[PDB]
Design an enzyme around this catalytic site. Structure first.
Site, mmCIF file in Angstrom:
data_model
loop_
_atom_site.group_PDB
_atom_site.id
_atom_site.type_symbol
_atom_site.label_atom_id
_atom_site.label_comp_id
_atom_site.label_asym_id
_atom_site.label_seq_id
_atom_site.Cartn_x
_atom_site.Cartn_y
_atom_site.Cartn_z
ATOM 1 C CG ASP A 21 -2.783 -0.423 -0.835
ATOM 2 O OD1 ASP A 21 -2.249 -1.639 -1.629
ATOM 3 O OD2 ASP A 21 -3.385 -0.715 0.296
ATOM 4 C CG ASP A 34 -4.248 -7.719 1.548
ATOM 5 O OD1 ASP A 34 -2.983 -7.227 1.966
ATOM 6 O OD2 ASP A 34 -4.649 -7.445 0.180
#
Lengths: 729, 729, 183, 183
Positions: free
Chosen positions: B549, B479
């Site tokens: 997301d 990430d």
């Protein structure tokens, strides 16, 4: 008065009867844009920007508030290095190599009138009470730079004028890699954008587009404001047209490299910058020095594009142009360029003068070819002395002849340019702008002078006063026939060569200002292969400008229509030229050429001695009629009525009391089975009664605007009709 | 075979059965673009650019020929200082301060295969003979720079791959202020442009626009390819759609700052550059050094966007991705981030593992919160040791439990980042990227590491191998949760600070490459707050990527639709998440979240232990169905059928032999009086007969593509149906 | 097809007529300029080229033509007799519609061995954009000789690359091309 | 003469409106809810609206995309109706205009409508048009001349209007002969 600061909620309000402009000091001393539009009496915080944590929009240094970000807030300005990812208004290079700048509110002051911009054209005031200026100062405490943001409102105009002045209060130099004159950020606006692109002999067509996410850039880096993209843009609602709807115009007062950027971002917001193009721009700002940007004129209309345009025309004409001629009717001249090109001598030109006098023309302009040994466009630029082969008794002798015939006399120069095959180049080869060790690229087989150097300007200046001190020249056509390609200034250190474009324009302005100031009784007409430098900054020095080398009546419709979006009609010139047209070969009726050339300041540019009797009679009638109407056509309020894509182009002027109007309607394509069209007028007094001076019929102003009248039906392409109305008692 | 140079006409021709690409050597050694499109066998000079003297478009040094100009010719490349006024492909700063470069043809070579790009991701060959590369060298004989333009063509693909390598053969350094990977100029094309803008949790919507005169810029300078604008663009005819019409696609293989420029000029031509964004980019090229750009993948489709997208999918999947997993079905996993966020311990996570095993899931991924003292997102980045409070017996104890339940185990890292509140910062404060003397701006209350320094990369590398050498981790989610804002590299001289963005990416690649190379048996999933770094470059390192997301089934329709325009569906991951949706609050049927999440690589991201019995049953059925179809859904040829602005979104995958198809159709808004809709399939063999495996009815492929079938009518928003067809004997 | 015999308005009329009706079903005559119905002025050669789309005829007082126009008629008639088998009966492809500022069309014989192309430009411009014309309906593996220039091009070239239209001043100008497959 | 009903089609409609000296410009429109009517009641098929219509996809052009063409084989009053209904379906009728049409059909009599030719193209309007051209030319036209090159004729109407006599026409004939004209 016009400008107030509410210290409770930190909001500046600039206000007159027509407009309000609101900005505020947000968190971190961030200067935030709230609103520009119709006037409101008061503000009560209803436009404070909503707080929301938006992924990847970061925050102020040392802040734990994630719902405020300089990457989402609408702002008055912006920079590299402040956690903003829009295209920034300014970019600074620091001694440590970084491009960081972090500006925060420091102070402000409010003053009457508006300050002169050093070395630059600018708008001004007649009485101090007619405007106020707000200067908001932002600072970066680490680099010790201060940005003054200037905002001027006029009492009686729907206008805000903005510019920027940067100050280095530190101990080391910085470089300015970009300094926008202004930034404006909008929220929840779905605008279209209007601009004026073109090409040589094809300037300033109206173009209009949707704004998608990303950045649309309209610019020039030709060293000039350019044929290809005028320094102007408007933002309008989807439904805005010539007569209704909101419009925001932005005109940059600058004649060099510009950049207009229109960005729509990830949150649907529209962010706009305008100013000097940052392309090879890097200005060395030493300790204690300052840098002033040109200004941008911003207009709000609540009621269509004509109204927007009219506000630009009035401001440019009344508070920018300095020329003693700006309020004076402009002469109907003949110019000999298309008539003869380089192939002429004094006797040839005298027969043209003689014919001009019989036709009632008021001025003869001698165009390219009178100087050095200019037999073609391969030589002589830089040698501003008469070519004796063509004028065996000197130029004074020809000028006397012109005056003797009752005409004014005009003369063409191209002061910025130099030819290899000139005396100037043989004596001062280093005057030629190039990068040392690299052959420069030619354009029209000529090159550009280093106008950034005082010695170069002084030489051209002295050559010119030698001709003009006789006061035999009444008018000057100042031309400029190529873009800048080899960008360098030989007397600057390597680390200042990012100044060459802008110093060139400053030098151009300086030379030009010196000449129009020394000869206030000379009418200067700007030119650059047509309208290649047609901008508000130029207007400051020259009250009129040759709109285009394209002199076809039909293509001129689109060029004059686009030009009028910003520029008053007295600022553009338009000549009747030969048919078939020399640039595109179109065949047009003589009367249509006349009528299209009366929108701008009328003149003639063809060999008058080769006209048929019938054409000559038509010139007699055109000039006689134009002398009766030109006060209205040149200086009346201008209304665009129909755009040529519709197959008709129409426009009109109304005098300031609405007692007199002149209307033109031009039909482009004929059709065997024509549809009836009507034309409706605009800008009349609904309670006056107007006589058509050709037919003697009288119509309420209300009838002319709501009913209009039928355009007459005729065969043939490219036909025009004019109308002249006068209010009766 | 694939590449020929005709030395008499000076035309290079790259050619296979599908495409031709033609370029020539024009006057002045100017490299001219002729054509890219459907293949032709021969070329006979018919595309020589017409000669016309165009006003203000200047000429070659010392040329008397005004009808040829680098300002109007369509070209393969361009630079500042060559009498061209379009946005330049390259800009160089010389020691004398000028930005002049004048490139002219020097030589060529043609090689088999294509050469590795040092330090960068790139496409490659399995057998040399499947592709050839033309390298054209241009030089500037004054600065002694050489630019190598690389063009690769594959025998069996409608693709041209381009990049540039600059070499300094002089005695002094230059700076590269811009180096585009490619330029392409088109004549008489009225294209629209398609791009993929978006935002965090709103990535890659299809945007489609007209192209007006001026420059349209699609770009990033967030230090990453970005959420806001994907490094991609296509040019299409006005009538081009998913199924027909020409399309040109351009994907930049680069995970940093990009800039796509689409200019329409004054002569109606379209000029395109793509490459590293030139914003604060200034690369110092010392004597005898070279600079390699990232490459661009260019695809031509003569038949709609599906066929363009499929050429990208195939190239990326077969000749760019290196992972040993790239051809392997991807696990159905559970990730705990939305299920628990930070609020968990080992025991909580074990109940979830237990439920996952019962539901037949294949992998458990431990997301953010397991390391340092990470209780929220205000600390601990840079401290990659297990958080003992949450895992009292160590990470291996938990990994072992996961494996005992028959599931693989995945772990999340954010290797590029640092918190003030960390041991990393306390021990090595100078690892934090910032301009010395200026407080850095926080984003998600974290900061970026100086990945441009070996020392910094080694530190993180060593921390990570300590965990991964256990062989207990089968999968890594990598990430990256903010953009770069304070741009500096503390160990470079002031005059190299324009290298900070590009050195950061090069370092990121260097660290990532080292890790994927050491752990060939670990499946890596890229991530950047969702899809903030979703590009062809990243694909070379990670064969799948977290798409957004945003896990709402309905907004994911647009995100996955736009993502698939360039990227194979096996490269994107999609998880069934809880309703109401955590990002936007939308309520959706559980089945609809399932069907939308099987377009990408299926996973679950919600607290399994809190599901009702009915949902657990749906999961059991979803997972059992997916295991049957996922070889086709994950790796079959993809066809988009319907876009969601139509109120329906639909897509299907067909295996390579056209024997099996899986189709999904999602209805967005219900209506009380619904119009009947039909769905027609694509990509089937018209002479095969396909059985619908739910109903047992059999239909010819021709029937399925020409007649289609009625979609079932139902009440309720946000409903989905799936179909599975298999060819019969 | 129409009492309107203006070459320029005929572009739209002939274009829309061909949507349904074979070109041999419509007649088109060369008429005087200025045009008798709309007063448009057009080059004599443009009237010829537009009137060869339909079945060519003349409708003007032949005895009042200048010698220059009579020579043009002799040449139009001589050329039309060579090509009229293809223009009257070849497969018709519309290429460009006049609203684009160009109108173009072409005919190809049934064996794709011969083609006749016409390109008409409506408005001139001082600063013209380059345009290309691409052909349609050819055999990609045949090689076609332009009978004016003697240059030879693959069918694939003529359909995918096309050729540059010549830049000329003046409104309402036409050019024709005649291609023939070679051995 | 026929009716055709479609489900889930978002067509545009192309027709050929015009006027005297202005026939058959291509017009192309969206189809909204309601009925769009293209018709003649002039007793002829008419200048103002040709008896023809096509339905096409939004992206259909001359070279690609679906098109449905409908040509009514009748030279009198026609009526083409394109209705889009309350459920998004498209309903089409073509035949004799019903305007002041009322045909008395006695016991044991019959009434035959004109026929409609319907063409389907999967690949643009040129291909649609070519199918109409071929059908009309090979299977409708009866004339012995339909396959013969058509004569390059002079017609004297715009040349003289009504103002002529034989001697005048003979001078035009003589000139026509020198120019190589055939009729």
């Amino acid at each position: 008065n016009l400008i107030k600061f509410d210290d409770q909620n930190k909001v500046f309000h600039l206000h007159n009867k027509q407009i309000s402009y609101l900005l505020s000091i947000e968190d971190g001393g961030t200067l935030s844009h709230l609103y520009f539009g119709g006037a409101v009496k008061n503000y009560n915080n209803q436009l404070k920007y909503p707080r929301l944590d938006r992924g990847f929009s970061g925050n102020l240094p040392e802040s734990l508030d994630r719902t405020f970000s300089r990457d989402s807030l609408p702002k008055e300005y912006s920079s590299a290095g402040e956690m903003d990812f829009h295209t920034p208004a300014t970019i600074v290079r620091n001694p440590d190599g970084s491009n960081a700048l972090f500006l925060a509110y420091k102070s402000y002051k409010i003053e009457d009138g508006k300050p002169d911009l050093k070395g630059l054209p600018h708008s001004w005031t007649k009485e101090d009470d007619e405007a106020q200026t707000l200067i908001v100062t932002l600072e970066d405490k680490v680099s010790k730079l201060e940005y003054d943001l200037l905002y001027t409102i006029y009492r009686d105009r729907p206008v805000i004028v903005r510019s920027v002045q940067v100050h280095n209060h530190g101990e080391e130099a910085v470089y300015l890699e970009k300094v926008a004159s202004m930034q404006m950020d909008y929220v929840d606006k779905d605008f279209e954008v209007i601009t004026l692109p073109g090409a040589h002999a094809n300037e300033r067509r109206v173009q209009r587009e949707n704004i998608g996410q990303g950045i649309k850039v309209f610019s020039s880096y030709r060293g000039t404001s350019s044929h290809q993209m005028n320094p102007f843009m408007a933002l309008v609602d989807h439904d805005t047209n010539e007569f209704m709807g909101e419009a925001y115009g932005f005109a940059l007062a600058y004649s060099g490299n510009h950049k207009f950027e229109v960005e729509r971002d990830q949150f649907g917001q529209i962010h706009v910058n305008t100013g000097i193009n940052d392309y090879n721009f890097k200005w060395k700002l030493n300790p204690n020095e300052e840098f002033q940007t040109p200004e941008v004129l911003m207009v709000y209309s609540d009621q269509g594009l004509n109204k927007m345009s009219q506000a630009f025309h009035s401001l440019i004409h009344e508070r920018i142009m300095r020329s003693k001629f700006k309020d004076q009717i402009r002469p109907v001249l003949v110019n000999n360029w298309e008539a003869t090109y380089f192939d002429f001598n004094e006797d040839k030109l005298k027969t043209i003068v003689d014919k001009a006098k019989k036709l009632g023309l008021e001025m003869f302009v001698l165009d390219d070819g009178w100087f050095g040994h200019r037999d073609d466009d391969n030589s002589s630029l830089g040698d501003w002395k008469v070519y004796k082969k063509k004028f065996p008794n000197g130029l004074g002798h020809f000028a006397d002849y012109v005056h003797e015939q009752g005409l004014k006399f005009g003369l063409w120069f191209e002061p910025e340019m130099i030819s290899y095959e000139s005396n100037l180049y043989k004596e001062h080869p280093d005057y030629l702008m190039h990068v040392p060790g690299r052959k420069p690229c030619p354009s029209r087989n000529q090159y550009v002078l280093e106008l950034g150097r005082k010695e170069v300007r002084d030489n051209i200046f002295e050559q010119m006063v030698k001709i003009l001190d006789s006061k035999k020249i009444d008018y000057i056509k100042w031309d400029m026939n190529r873009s800048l390609s080899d960008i360098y200034e030989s007397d600057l250190p390597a680390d200042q060569q990012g100044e060459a474009y802008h110093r060139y324009v400053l030098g151009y302005y300086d030379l030009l200002n010196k000449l129009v100031t020394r000869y206030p009784d000379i009418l200067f007409e700007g030119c650059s292969g047509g309208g290649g430098r047609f901008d508000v900054g130029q207007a400051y020095y020259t009250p009129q400008i040759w709109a285009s080398d394209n002199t076809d009546a039909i293509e001129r419709l689109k060029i004059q229509y686009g030009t009028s979006l910003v520029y008053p009609q007295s600022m553009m010139t338009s000549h009747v030229s030969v048919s078939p047209n020399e640039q595109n070969g179109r065949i047009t009726p003589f009367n249509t050429r006349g009528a299209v050339a009366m929108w701008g300041d009328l003149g003639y540019e063809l060999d008058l001695t080769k006209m048929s009797d019938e054409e000559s009679d038509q010139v007699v009638k055109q000039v006689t009629e134009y002398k009766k109407i030109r006060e209205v056509t040149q200086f009346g309020t201008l209304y665009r009525l129909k755009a040529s894509a519709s197959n008709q182009c129409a426009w009109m002027m109304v005098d300031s009391n609405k007692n007199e109007a002149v209307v033109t309607v031009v039909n482009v394509m004929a059709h065997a089975q024509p549809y009836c069209t009507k034309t409706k007028l605009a800008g009349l007094d609904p309670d006056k009664r107007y006589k058509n001076l050709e037919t003697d019929e009288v119509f309420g102003g209300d009838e002319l605007m709501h009913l209009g009248f039928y355009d007459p039906i005729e065969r043939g392409d490219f036909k025009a009709k004019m109308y002249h109305f006068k209010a009766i008692n």
